[PDB]
From Swiss-Prot:
Expressed in the CNS and midgut. Disulfide bonds: none annotated. It is found in: Nucleus. It comes from Drosophila melanogaster (Fruit fly). This is Homeobox protein vnd. Belongs to the NK-2 homeobox family. Probable transcriptional regulator involved in the regulation of the proneural AS-C genes and the neurogenic genes of the enhancer of split complex. Could specifically activate proneural genes in the ventral-most neuroectoderm.
């Protein structure tokens, strides 16, 4: 459901719920990038790891609205 899906694409995924997807998309509209004093505070506020938040903002800047998302695609980021 959150760590699994009945499809064949990617494999290994991340699939996050409505608190997690809310905060990540709302910084992706107003910002590009978010530095360590405020990025680690966003990960402690929402409850995730520093390495999964860092590579979420890495994979979202990658020509993303098609399945040509060549390096760093965890589903369809």
């Amino acid at each position: 459901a959150s760590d699994g899906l009945p499809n064949k694409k990617r494999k290994r995924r991340v699939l996050f719920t409505k608190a997690q997807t809310y905060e990540l998309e709302r910084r992706f509209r107003q910002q590009r990038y978010l530095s360590a004093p405020e990025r680690e505070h966003l990960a402690s506020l929402i409850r995730l790891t520093p390495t999964q938040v860092k590579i979420w903002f890495q994979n979202h800047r990658y020509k993303t609205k098609r399945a040509q998302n060549e390096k760093g695609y965890e589903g369809h980021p």
